[PDB]
Design a protein around this ligand. Structure first.
Ligand code: CLA
Ligand code: CLA
Ligand code: CLA
Ligand code: CLA
Ligand code: CLA
Ligand code: CLA
Ligand code: CLA
Ligand SMILES: CC(=O)O[C@H]1CC(C)(C)C(=C=C/C(C)=C/C=C/C(C)=C/C=C/C=C(C)/C=C\C=C(/C)C(=O)C[C@@]23O[C@]2(C)C[C@@H](O)CC3(C)C)[C@](C)(O)C1
Ligand SMILES: CC(=O)O[C@H]1CC(C)(C)C(=C=C/C(C)=C/C=C\C(C)=C/C=C\C=C(C)\C=C\C=C(/C)C(=O)C[C@@]23O[C@]2(C)C[C@@H](O)CC3(C)C)[C@](C)(O)C1
Ligand SMILES: CC1=C(/C=C/C(C)=C/C=C/C(C)=C/C=C/C=C(C)/C=C/C=C(C)/C=C/C2=C(C)CCCC2(C)C)C(C)(C)CCC1
Ligand SMILES: CC1=C(C/C=C(\C)CCC[C@H](C)CCC[C@H](C)CCCC(C)C)C(=O)c2ccccc2C1=O
Ligand code: SF4
Ligand code: SF4
Lengths: 40, 62, 33, 160, 80, 732, 89, 74, 29, 74
């Protein structure tokens, strides 16, 4: 477990997870609040 | 003062570690041109972490 | 007539001149003064 | 109006664009039929199109001759939503990221292995440091006036 | 042909003379360093300009510097 | 030396082909030649300049001669808007009968149409007959000969100028400013008043009657009396037909402002007044420096005294006087820089304030001139920075310029380079990002979601000078503004007409599309500058090579060690910057052409809407306007655009060939050449013949130069064909 | 020679004549010169703004043109007065 | 193996194989469908057989027909 | 119209320039 | 070069439609014979002409190809 957590703490892995999360939240925002070119 | 385990700032303009801090390892007392041997924590463009400097090229930092 | 000049000079400027010039340069660069 | 533009709510070109767009989708839907999954999708798409144009119409956006929205960024607060307000968002978020990053690097710099902690991040510490960036504006100013942000010619320089 | 110069910062590691592909460098007696030896370039007429020597020097800045210059058959490595 | 490079023993004693290659490219670096004294250097340079001047005059003479002997100037003069100007005739023995007919269209012999604008310029300045042009050519040939004699004369033993003469800055500046620029302008206004303006009104004034044909009815009486207003009375009517007396006036010096109604070009009277004013300014300015008459300023003192009291700029400008006087490279850099700015200004102001008659109506010529000067400007700019770097490596004295304004620049080099980098990054990311956003949304069929910023700041400036479309009621666009009141009775009347006329290039209308392209041009300038500036500052040394100054401006590398030191010399910065220079100039030229093309075609909207995304440029500009060019010669025939078509493809070849030198390096080629040597020596019969210069591969730097040249030549040639064939094929 | 250090330049930099002039005199001259320049501008402004009658550039007057050159001189003189004052003269 | 598996699955749940099988000449092959996010739906073409998706060009449908698949259960 | 004589005169002038050019080149050498 | 040869040759001398009677209409019209013998021909009758689809793909289900075409150039 400890060792696996270290692998999951490696730079490449963390970047992918973080970017996936970031991408996801951006996509989700556009799904519910779509087509915005300004704050209204 | 330059002495074993002392920390100094390099004053050689050609050095990769100019204006940086290093730790004096040993100072030879046989009259060699560059007696002090300073060690750095960062490798140079060649991959070395040590070099020998003269006492004038080194200023003690503390 | 001057009108004939294009047909008398162009052959010389584009063929004879360049040749001799190149030859001279070669002889100049291949010589050991 | 500013720059001779016209409000999109009052621009005929804008409306023409809307009608045309919807027509295209509708013409496609005609081929499919009734509750056919394809037709329902196209139908939903037209709703979104109508909504988008409506939103822009109710907005303060100014359209040009082409009937396309043009943004204003000269500092006027009348059109702040177009650039100023969104701009603050970027600055806040960007500063947050930069500040927290610098903090972590400086924090792990004094560790047993300062280079292992850059390739294998200490997640627990990182999360703590990341949360403390919401007040980056204040912290940064405080660090500047404390002579702890900008260094003083004790850094490596070129030979000349 | 090329010019190779050695500076006082040499430490007599002999690494340079062991890397030259054409025996241009030698180790000569000296007293300025602990090793008691310094490098010399007696036969620069055979330097090809490889700069392998410079790559081997351990000093902060190369104690052995090769300045490329006039080119001859030997320096241009021409077997023909 | 005893071989080809007489000025270099090193190269002369080389046993390979390099001796020949390098000798040719190191010929004009007189400063590095074996045994060169400063005095000789200056003397040889002075003579070389005479030769250059002669070449320029011979070139001008040829244009006049060929236009006069093989052109249609007189016919063009008669019907300027219905005749195509001829440059020179064509005699190619490789042409087929069809080609002879195609290129002979409109005339009786194969001919090339000129896009240089000489006809309009000569028409405006007064030329009306072919015989006149002939006289000019003959005169210039004579002047060229005189200049050649001068070069020989000043290299003779008793006429060689001293080194001191070459360094008398005050006298040269005074003379050059007051005489070369000031008096010359006065002479020009004389010509305009005596010959040009009379011709525009139908009167012939030549060497035959100039001494008996007064330029103005009043005479020089008003001038000396002080009643100068007389020379501005009775300006040509708005119904004046050029080259004729109908509706003519008598004014010779005026400030009408705007364009002649019929020729759509600036009034000649105004140009005369312009040059007269400029003359006085320069003549006065040429009396500022001390030149053996007591009065005057000493440049050294002026520079030394200028040190801000606060100390923010260190010791100030002390020490710069000696540095400039003793460095020819810095002088050249300063000159090239200023000339580069001038060339760009000529291009920008000449298309808006048309100076020559009926030039605006010749679309192709107008397009060529702009692209011509803009490209020259780029080369001139890059050269300035290049010589600036050469200066630091060769002529910079660290001690003389202690705490000088120049030295302090090299102290915060990192700050300058880093910040320029940030600017480039900011501009790059957002400009490209916005373009791609617009492309994607449009592609998905939702153009209403594009991010288009109006160029409000520029629009404001246009309004400030009088434009009214933007509706910004400011300055000259406001009737109540104090500014309007001031010039309303002076020059505004005419200006406000032209600026608010949609059929003129005076302050063309701008829109969201122009915003983006301008920011792209900004990126180009900043990035090109970064490369050049870094090269200059990091030319005397860096962390990788702290001893760079001892190797020179151009060296191959410093070895495969310390990580690898390829392209570390300053010369390489020039090499890298050239590519960016071409790119930026390309963007600038593309913008001008497309915008104008749509305007000329009558559909300004195409640019306004399609310029927002990249696909528009590719499809509605490059693809659409390439149809005339690619059909110069087809499986069904050929037309006069065949030459332009062929050149277009030719350019692509040279450009790509350049890639070979840029991507492939020496090692591979050297080994291959070795095998070829073996073959020749082992093949019977050919063994009889042998070389005297050992065959070797091109050097590292040489290949870089060769490649850059191939890339550059192809770049220019291909665009030259497009800009000409596309414009001519569609509108001509 | 002309190189200087401190908070005020030496009088030698003001030339061969003004270097001997008193600070007050220079100040008086400066104020007068500026006045002439401003007067010229205001007066010329009226001419440019008067209905008609300025055709053929009649608004340009030799006196006003010369007077307008006082403005640049005003700058120089005022700067010089300061230098002289600091120098003690 | 995972790659091949995915292709067959996508041809079972996101394709118009059945319709194409009946009229191979008219219906266009499609085995990829895009989610309706951000106007990317335009990429879902009207291939045929009451189905909208991206027209694939790998030749899976032809191969399956030759093997005799017939159904999407297979 | 440029007459033949005129064209020939021009050519003569050019020749003078050429001979004077060779000298300048050889003097710079 | 090989793939381009395939594309032009086929679209010019093989692919196409044939009427109930014997009338063969190839996609490009047989231009390969007299146009592929010159470099200008390839640039005009192939690259310039056959690229009309990608450049005009915006607003359609083929829009992706247009974007990728541009992205690849970059
Ligand atoms: C301005 C320079 C110039 C001129 C005037 C010509 C002229 C000609 N070329 Mg040409 N050419 C040139 C540059 C030039 N070329 C260049 C730069 C290239 C390289 C791309 C070529 C490549 C080229 C090819 C590949 C061919 C030609 C051919 C021809 C001939 C076709 C017309 C004809 O009647 O052929 C019929 C030929 C004749 C009626 C014979 C004419 C008598 C000959 C030319 C006498 C030559 C003697 C000459 C003095 C020897 C030179 C001595 C040396 C010291 C310079 C014509 C004589 C064609 C040809 O037939 O060549 C002869 C041909 O196949 N050219
Ligand atoms: C050099 C370009 C430039 C720059 C840097 C600015 C900067 C600014 N403008 Mg601005 N502006 C410009 C050109 C420029 N303007 C031009 C050319 C116009 C005319 C089209 C305007 C018209 C304009 C208006 C109408 C307003 C601003 C305002 C502002 C300010 C934004 C409010 C704030 O607190 O921040 C800011 C200082 C606002 C302001 O002053 O808020 C108090 C405001 O209301 N600007
Ligand atoms: C009145 C006397 C006089 C005159 C007419 C000249 C004339 C000349 N001298 Mg000169 N010289 C003089 C006295 C004089 N000299 C004296 C007294 C000395 C000894 C101290 C010298 C020493 C000297 C040297 C050492 C050299 C010259 C050279 C030259 C020539 C420069 C090249 C050329 O033709 O450019 C003429 C170019 C133009 C007329 C075009 C000018 C274009 C500019 C850009 C116009 C700018 C207008 C405006 C400012 C732009 C506004 C926009 C801006 C804000 C961007 C030129 C013929 C050089 C030469 O070639 O010698 C052979 C040279 O090397 N001179
Ligand atoms: C008044 C302008 C001027 C002057 C007097 C000089 C003078 C000088 N420059 Mg300089 N330069 C200039 C403008 C100028 N330059 C400009 C505008 C640039 C920017 C491009 C440069 C860039 C530059 C660099 C990068 C270097 C110089 C160097 C030099 C020095 C040696 C030049 C040399 O060896 O050439 C010798 C002769 C040649 C190179 C022959 C040139 C052949 C060219 C490259 C190819 C011709 C084009 C092609 C053949 C066209 C055919 C196309 C066809 C198929 C259609 C010399 C002092 C060199 C130096 O070290 O000085 C210290 C150097 O490294 N200059
Ligand atoms: C298409 C060709 C191309 C492109 C795109 C670039 C791009 C760049 N070059 Mg370059 N270069 C090229 C060809 C190219 N080069 C060639 C052929 C040469 C030979 C002469 C050079 C020589 C050269 C030199 C000598 C220098 C550059 C520099 C630069 C950078 C300038 C700063 C900039 O624009 O930042 C913005 C960069 C980009 C927009 C490009 C990358 C974009 C990617 C896709 C990121 C996009 C992000 C997007 C906006 C969204 C971000 C958020 C997302 C993560 C969610 C930039 C990375 C300079 C440099 O180092 O920069 C300081 C520099 O000194 N180049
Ligand atoms: C000597 C020939 C001459 C003539 C006839 C004109 C004629 C003109 N100039 Mg002009 N000018 C000239 C030389 C000349 N200029 C020169 C050499 C300069 C450079 C200093 C100028 C600078 C100049 C400016 C800056 C202005 C004019 C203006 C004018 C116009 C009205 C003023 C007038 O007629 O003179 C009136 C002058 C006198 C009666 C005597 C003046 C004597 C001086 C001060 C000595 C008129 C079109 C004005 C105009 O209408 O433009 C908006 C304007 O503002 N000119
Ligand atoms: C060659 C293999 C392959 C490829 C390229 C695709 C591609 C695709 N499939 Mg598909 N599929 C495949 C095999 C494949 N499939 C197989 C074998 C099956 C059977 C299980 C399926 C079952 C399947 C279904 C049921 C669906 C798809 C869908 C899709 C599409 C959306 C993909 C998706 O979920 O995006 C979004 C991506 C995600 C949601 C995943 C989240 C991203 C993760 C978290 C990043 C990875 C984390 C990283 C590896 C951490 C490393 C940790 C370390 C231990 C390694 C896409 C075109 C969907 C579709 O088309 O809907 C219309 C859909 O509904 N596929
Ligand atoms: C003790 C005693 O005796 O006096 C005392 C008491 C007293 C009187 C209080 C003192 C004082 C005097 C002071 C403070 C004096 C002066 C201060 C001053 C005078 C400060 C700036 C002038 C700046 C100018 C003019 C700037 C630009 C002028 C410019 C920019 C121009 O362009 C002119 C212009 O011409 C052009 C080139 C073209 C022309 O066609 C038209 C125009 C107009 C456009 C002192 C110092 O304490 C000494
Ligand atoms: C940084 C810079 O550039 O500074 C430069 C600026 C500048 C101008 C170049 C300089 C200069 C030289 C000088 C002296 C400049 C000053 C003035 C200048 C410009 C010229 C001089 C005298 C003109 C006179 C005497 C008028 C004759 C005019 C007369 C006699 C008349 O009025 C005739 C006339 O009356 C009749 C008879 C009847 C009337 O109905 C018609 C009029 C009214 C027209 C400076 C000051 O040295 C330095
Ligand atoms: C490397 C080097 C060098 C070079 C440098 C350079 C190349 C520079 C450039 C520079 C530049 C290139 C600059 C530019 C500038 C510009 C400017 C400065 C502008 C200005 C403007 C103004 C001042 C204003 C104007 C106006 C007016 C008049 C009025 C109103 C409007 C306006 C806008 C228009 C040398 C050799 C020296 C040496 C050292 C190093
Ligand atoms: C092709 C190639 C070569 C070989 C190219 C050569 C040898 C060019 C040879 C042909 C040119 C045109 C010279 C031929 C000159 C004629 C023999 C006539 C010479 C007459 C003299 C009097 C000048 C290199 O040497 C090289 C070096 C470094 C990087 C890339 C490359 C590279 O790509
Ligand atoms: S450059 Fe090569 S040949 Fe010359 S001394 Fe160094 S290792 Fe020896
Ligand atoms: S130029 Fe050659 S030796 Fe120098 S760094 Fe590059 S590969 Fe190594």
């Amino acid at each position: 477990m400890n060792d696996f957590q270290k692998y999951l703490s490696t730079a490449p892995v963390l970047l992918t997870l973080w970017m996936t999360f970031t991408a996801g939240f951006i996509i989700e925002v556009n799904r519910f609040f779509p087509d915005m070119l300004g704050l209204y | 003062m330059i002495d074993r385990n002392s920390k100094v700032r390099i004053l050689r303009k050609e050095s990769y570690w100019f204006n940086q801090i290093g730790t004096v390892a040993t100072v030879d007392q046989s009259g060699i041109r560059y007696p002090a041997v300073v060690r750095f924590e960062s490798v140079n463009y060649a991959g070395t972490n040590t070099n020998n400097f003269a006492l004038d090229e080194l200023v003690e930092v503390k | 007539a001057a009108s004939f000049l294009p047909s008398i000079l162009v052959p010389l400027v584009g063929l004879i001149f360049p040749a001799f010039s190149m030859a001279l340069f070669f002889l100049y660069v291949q010589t050991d003064d | 109006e500013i720059g001779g533009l016209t409000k999109c709510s009052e621009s005929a070109a804008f409306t023409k664009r809307l009608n045309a767009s919807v027509k295209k989708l509708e013409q496609r839907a005609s081929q499919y039929e009734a509750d056919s999954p394809p037709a329902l999708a196209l139908k939903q798409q037209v709703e979104r199109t109508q909504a988008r144009f409506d939103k822009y119409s109710r907005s303060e956006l100014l359209c040009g001759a082409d009937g396309l929205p043009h943004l204003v960024a000269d500092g006027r607060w009348s059109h702040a939503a177009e650039f100023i307000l969104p701009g603050f968002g970027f600055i806040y978020i960007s500063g947050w990221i930069g500040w927290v990053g610098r903090k972590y690097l400086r924090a792990v710099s004094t560790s047993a292995n300062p280079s292992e902690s850059e390739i294998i991040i200490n997640v627990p510490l990182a999360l703590k440091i990341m949360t403390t960036g919401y007040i980056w504006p204040i912290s940064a100013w405080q660090e500047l006036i404390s002579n702890d942000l900008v260094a003083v010619s004790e850094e490596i320089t070129v030979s000349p | 042909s090329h010019t190779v110069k050695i500076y006082d910062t040499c430490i007599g590691c002999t690494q340079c003379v062991r890397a030259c592909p054409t025996d241009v460098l030698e180790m000569v007696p000296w007293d300025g360093c602990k090793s008691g030896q310094i490098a010399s370039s007696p036969r620069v007429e055979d330097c090809v300009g490889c700069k392998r020597c410079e790559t081997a020097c351990p000093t902060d800045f190369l104690s052995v510097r090769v300045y490329l210059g006039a080119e001859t058959t030997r320096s241009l490595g021409l077997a023909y | 030396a005893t071989k080809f490079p007489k000025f270099s023993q090193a190269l002369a004693q080389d046993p390979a082909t390099r001796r020949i290659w390098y000798g040719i490219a190191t010929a004009h670096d007189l400063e590095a030649h074996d045994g060169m004294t400063e005095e000789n250097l200056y003397q040889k340079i002075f003579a070389s300049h005479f030769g250059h001047l002669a070449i320029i005059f011979l070139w001008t003479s040829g244009n006049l001669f060929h236009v006069a002997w093989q052109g249609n100037f007189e016919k063009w003069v008669s019907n300027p808007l219905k005749t195509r100007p001829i440059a020179h005739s064509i005699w190619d023995p490789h042409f087929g009968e069809s080609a002879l007919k195609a290129f002979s269209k409109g005339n009786t012999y194969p001919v090339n149409i000129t896009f240089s604008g000489l006809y309009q310029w000569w028409y405006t300045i007064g030329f009306r007959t072919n015989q006149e042009l002939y006289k000019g050519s003959i005169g210039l040939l004579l002047l060229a000969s005189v200049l050649l004699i001068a070069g020989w004369l000043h290299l003779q033993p008793k006429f060689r100028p001293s080194l001191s003469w070459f360094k008398n800055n005050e006298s040269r500046l005074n003379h050059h400013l007051s005489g070369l620029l000031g008096f010359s302008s006065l002479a020009w206004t004389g010509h305009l008043v005596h010959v040009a303006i009379p011709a525009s009104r139908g009167v012939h004034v030549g060497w035959d009657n100039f001494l008996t044909t007064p330029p103005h009815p009043a005479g020089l009486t008003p001038f000396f009396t002080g009643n100068w207003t007389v020379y501005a009375e009775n300006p040509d009517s708005a119904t004046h037909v050029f080259n004729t007396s109908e509706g003519s006036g008598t004014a010779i010096l005026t400030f009408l402002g705007g364009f002649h109604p019929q020729t759509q070009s600036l009034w000649l009277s105004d140009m005369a007044h312009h040059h007269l004013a400029i003359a006085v300014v320069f003549i006065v300015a040429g009396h500022m420096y001390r030149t053996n008459f007591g009065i005057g300023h000493n440049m050294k003192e002026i520079l030394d005294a200028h040190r801000p009291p606060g100390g923010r700029l260190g010791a100030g400008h002390v020490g710069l006087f000696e540095t400039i006087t003793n460095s020819l490279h810095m002088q050249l850099g300063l000159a090239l820089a200023c000339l580069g700015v001038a060339t760009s200004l000529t291009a920008q102001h000449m298309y808006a304030l048309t100076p020559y008659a009926y030039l605006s109506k010749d679309f192709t010529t107008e397009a060529a001139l702009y692209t011509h000067h803009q490209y020259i400007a780029g080369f001139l700019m890059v050269g300035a920075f290049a010589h600036g770097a050469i200066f630091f490596v060769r002529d910079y004295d660290p001690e003389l310029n202690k705490n000088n304004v120049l030295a302090r620049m090299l102290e915060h080099k990192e700050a300058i380079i880093s910040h320029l980098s940030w600017a480039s990054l900011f501009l790059g990311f957002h400009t490209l990002g916005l373009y791609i956003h617009n492309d994607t949304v449009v592609a998905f069929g939702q153009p209403e979601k594009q991010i288009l910023f109006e160029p409000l700041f520029a629009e404001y400036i246009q309004a400030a000078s009088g434009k009214a479309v933007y509706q910004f009621n400011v300055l000259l666009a406001s009737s109540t503004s104090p500014a309007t009141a001031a010039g309303n009775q002076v020059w505004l009347p005419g200006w406000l007409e032209a600026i608010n006329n949609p059929k003129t290039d005076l302050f063309l209308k701008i829109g969201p599309g122009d915003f983006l392209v301008h920011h792209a041009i900004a990126l180009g300038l900043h990035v090109t500058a970064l490369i050049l500036v870094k090269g200059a500052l990091d030319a005397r040394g860096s962390k990788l090579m702290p001893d760079k100054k001892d190797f020179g401006y151009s060296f191959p590398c410093d070895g495969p060690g310390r990580g690898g030191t390829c392209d570390i010399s300053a010369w390489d910065a020039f090499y890298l910057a050239m590519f960016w220079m071409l790119n930026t100039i390309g963007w600038v030229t593309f913008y001008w052409h497309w915008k104008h093309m749509t305007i000329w075609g009558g559909n300004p909207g195409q640019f306004d809407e399609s310029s927002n995304y990249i696909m528009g440029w590719l499809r509605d500009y490059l693809w659409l306007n390439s149809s005339p060019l690619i059909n110069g010669y087809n499986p069904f025939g050929m037309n006069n655009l065949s030459v332009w078509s062929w050149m277009f493809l030719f350019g692509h070849l040279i450009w790509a060939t350049g890639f070979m030198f840029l991507i492939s390096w020496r090692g591979y080629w050297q080994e291959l050449i070795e095998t070829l040597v073996w073959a020749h020596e082992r093949t019977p019969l050919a063994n009889l013949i042998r070389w005297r210069d050992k065959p070797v591969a091109l050097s590292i730097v040489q290949a870089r130069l060769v490649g850059l040249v191939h890339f550059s030549v192809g770049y220019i040639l291909t665009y030259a064909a497009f800009v000409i064939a596309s414009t001519s094929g569609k509108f001509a | 020679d002309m190189t200087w250090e401190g908070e005020y330049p030496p009088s030698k930099v003001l030339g061969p004549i003004m270097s001997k002039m008193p600070s007050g005199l220079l100040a008086i001259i400066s104020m007068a010169s500026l006045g002439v320049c401003v007067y010229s501008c205001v007066q010329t402004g009226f001419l440019l703004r008067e209905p008609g009658a300025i055709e053929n550039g009649s608004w340009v007057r030799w006196y006003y043109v010369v007077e307008g050159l006082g403005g640049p001189l005003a700058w120089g003189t005022h700067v010089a007065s300061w230098i002289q004052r600091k120098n003690g003269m | 193996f995972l790659w091949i598996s995915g292709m067959h699955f996508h041809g079972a749940y996101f394709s118009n194989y059945s319709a194409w099988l009946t009229d191979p000449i008219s219906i266009k092959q499609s085995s990829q469908v895009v989610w309706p996010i951000v106007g990317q739906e335009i990429l879902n073409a009207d291939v045929g057989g009451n189905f909208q998706g991206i027209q694939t060009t790998s030749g899976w449908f032809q191969m399956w027909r030759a093997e005799g698949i017939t159904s999407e259960v297979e | 119209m440029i007459t033949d004589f005129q064209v020939y005169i021009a050519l003569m002038a050019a020749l003078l320039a050429s001979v004077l050019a060779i000298r300048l080149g050889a003097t710079l050498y | 070069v090989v793939i381009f040869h395939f594309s032009w040759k086929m679209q010019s001398d093989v692919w196409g439609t044939i009427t109930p009677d014997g009338a063969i209409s190839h996609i490009t019209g047989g231009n390969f014979a007299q146009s592929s013998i010159t470099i200008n021909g390839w640039l005009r009758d192939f690259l310039w002409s056959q690229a009309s689809q990608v450049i005009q793909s915006y607003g359609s289900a083929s829009s992706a190809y247009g974007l990728i075409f541009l992205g690849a150039h970059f």
